[PDB]
């Protein structure tokens, strides 16, 4: 009743980081999105 | 799997992490840099 | 017409160095966000 009890922990840690990794992925792309659409329109205007 | 799969990253998130840091740095950079440049306008 | 013609290339000169000197800074920052982004 240790080695699942551990695999089953381990298992449902990696499914919350993955989740959290996820999300902060999805928010990083965002900010990224953003950042570079501002440094595109700043470069254009600095052309 | 296929929902997990589908948010786009497929490295791990600690480089895409470093590389999104480095880019709001590299952002930031630039704007105060963009300020800073039309900012000083004295010439005639 | 030659007091005329030296204030006027005394302004030409003026304003040549300002607009190199825009030129420059102009080039040295576009330079500077390309490399930093």
């Known amino acids: 009743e240790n080695q699942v009890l551990e695999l089953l922990i381990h298992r449902d840690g990696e499914f919350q980081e993955l989740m959290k990794l996820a999300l902060n992925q999805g928010k990083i792309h965002h900010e990224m999105q953003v950042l570079e659409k501002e440094v595109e329109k700043r470069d254009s205007d600095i052309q | 799997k296929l929902i997990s799969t589908m948010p786009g990253i497929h490295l791990s998130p600690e480089q895409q992490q470093q590389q999104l840091q480095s880019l709001r740095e590299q952002v930031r950079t630039k704007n105060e840099l963009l300020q800073k440049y039309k900012s000083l306008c004295m010439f005639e | 017409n030659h007091e005329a013609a030296t204030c006027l290339e005394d ?6 160095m300002l607009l190199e000197k825009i030129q420059s800074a102009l080039a040295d920052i576009a330079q500077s966000q390309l490399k930093t982004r």
Do not use: E, H
Not at chain 3, 11 to 16: E, I, K, L, P, S
């Open chain 3, 11 to 16: 302004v030409v000169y003026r304003g040549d």
